[PDB]
Ligand code: HEM
Ligand code: HEM
């Protein structure tokens with residue numbers, strides 16, 4: 001939708017600092033810890049029954065990286081997000097049936113993790129702003145089919 | 148999106164029994180009563196400070212009818228809902244800023260009012276089903292711009 | 295929080311709709327599965343496809359309404375009186391909290407649909423507050 | 438509900454972040470207005486356009502965090518200790534409950550952003566549970 005150069009810049013610039021394999025694992029791990037009902041969706045990850053089980057489980061770390069790769073797909077196609085997320089929508093919302101609001105929760109956890117990594121001087125109100133408009137779009141593109 | 152004849156039928160058939168000027172007022176009135184924080188948006192309706200104030204206020208009854216006319220616009224354009232709601236989206240979500248979840252709340256109250264009017268033998272699980280897929284679409288088409 | 299007034303309103307409604315609860319619960323559950331298919335994922339062990347007509351659902355219908363009838367009876371301490379349903383839901387089954395809203399809606403829908411004259415605006419408020427409080431008690435064992 | 442453990446975790450965090458609350462609140466409020474413009478509708482009386490740099494917001498920042506510091510101090514009865522903020526928010530201003538989630542997020546975001554080493558997964562859980570409980574106490578006077 002309407003992205004400005006200022007927005008693309010801030011977002012691209014931020015995705016470019018982020019180390020996917022580090023923020024991804026931490027984010028997906030927090031989702032599972034802080035909001036434990038999300039665990040029901042990853043029954044195929046094995047041992048995630050305790051918080052240390054979770055923090056150590058390599059399958060969780062692996063999947064956290066897949067999520068960041070999924071986000072990269074959008075940062076790479078910022079003007080067609082909805083169409084390029086054609087598959088991820090269907091999977092999550094037509095097959096798995098993740099309640100929409102969980103997308104927001106993981107979106108928030110990543111932002112928070114992005115925050116704790118870079119600080120208030122890189123993750124400024126201005127960046128934070130472009131970034132949030134970005135996740136709001138991803139979130140919207142991820143859901144649908146359930147209703 | 149994908150509407151079947153069975154769905155269009157049930158929906159059209161139901162909209163055709165409904166008396167807009169009767170369900171509308173009751174629905175908008177309940178919204179204001181049951182979820183009072185929605186009152187902040189209708190400050191131009193005058194006296195709605197008490198539940199009887201609300202139930203009697205003609206401005207509330209008038210507006211409830213405008214809401215049902217807005218829904219008629221969709222029942223009339225079931226395959227372009229999103230585009231025909233181009234204006235209502237902007238108003239509610241870009242100008243007024245009604246939190247999205249309120250759309251769901253009014254959607255639920257109307258359904259409930261539709262329910263109390265016709266009963267379990269007209270508002271069957273089958274109808275209830277087509278109807279819900281319908282409001283889910285309206286709700287989605289009404290919001291956006293806020294994020 | 296439920297006020298004493300709220301409790302008094304829920305009590306009058308429940309006493310009035312009791313008995314018929316069994317059909318109301320069958321209806322409520324039966325309608326959630328059909329109208330909000332995302333909820334069916336929690337009942338995939340059940341057989342025939344899930345509507346009011348399947349036995350499992352119609353029997354589980356009376357079950358929920360029985361628990362709800364019991365919640366009304368302990369309206370002064372839903373937390374304490376609901377800790378086992380919470381451990382079952384929030385801990386054992388890992389139900390997404392977002393679904394409590396769905397069942398509640400289908401329940402209020404059924405009530406208004408059965409006792410319309412009695413589900414006045416003021417009652418609708420209290421019964422909605424109660425169901426919201428019920429979900430809160432059930433979300434107790436999540437974290 | 439907050440468990441004693443939860444309370445103990447919120448207490449350790451708060452004691453640690455106190456003082457800096459004033460800048461954290463300025464930041465939190467400043468970020469909500471900018472990142473979630475739908476919230477600005479509640480502050481249209483304020484002047485300069487709303488960011489962390491405007492005085493009204495930076496001063497109201499310390500204000501919220503002061504109330505939050507006070508909530509922590511009455512963590513055993515947020516309802517009773519918060520009834521006046523609730524009457525103000527839920528009754529006087531008619532704030533949409535859906536916004537409490539927004540402020541909370543911006544607050545946790547600021548905390549993690551300022552005391553990252555201290556906002557571990559377990560803390561994040563408790564502080565999120567507390568903020569959720571806070572909103573519950575403030576939503577007390579809605580209906
Ligand atoms: C920022 C939001 C999210 C993004 C971008 C995202 C991205 C992804 C990606 C890239 C995949 C791989 C898809 C494929 O197989 O083609 C995936 C799968 C999956 N995601 Fe997400 N996801 C998000 C949020 C969530 C949430 C909140 C949940 C859970 C509550 C969830 C549950 C799953 C599940 C269960 C799978 C497949 C796993 C399995 O079979 O065990 N996702 N996601
Ligand atoms: C089924 C969902 C809804 C429908 C179809 C709907 C429809 C309408 C329609 C047809 C109008 C007239 C628009 C125009 O001026 O062109 C309108 C205006 C308005 N609606 Fe909605 N609406 C819905 C939900 C809501 C909710 C949930 C709120 C409040 C929480 C809301 C707040 C308003 C306001 C404030 C106005 C303009 C009023 C004024 O200036 O005083 N609407 N709506």
Ligand code: HEM
Nearest residue numbers: 333336337339357358361362379387389393394397429432
């Ligand atoms: C919020 C109101 C709810 C109440 C009063 C309620 C009540 C109950 C009761 C009484 C039982 C039977 C327990 C037993 O056999 O020991 C139960 C089980 C269960 N509930 Fe809930 N429930 C509620 C919400 C939900 C929701 C929102 C879902 C998810 C869509 C759900 C999913 C389940 C499942 C999957 C079972 C186990 C069923 C089986 O296979 O026997 N419940 N619930």
Ligand code: HEM
Nearest residue numbers: 476479480482500501504505522530532536537540572575
């Ligand atoms: C959930 C956490 C919240 C806390 C701890 C909090 C705390 C406070 C405090 C301490 C005051 C100052 C009261 C006074 O001057 O007497 C206040 C006022 C107010 N709050 Fe909140 N607040 C919260 C959430 C919100 C939210 C979600 C909004 C809406 C976006 C909001 C809107 C307002 C407004 C509009 C005022 C009056 C401001 C003025 O013009 O002076 N607050 N709040």
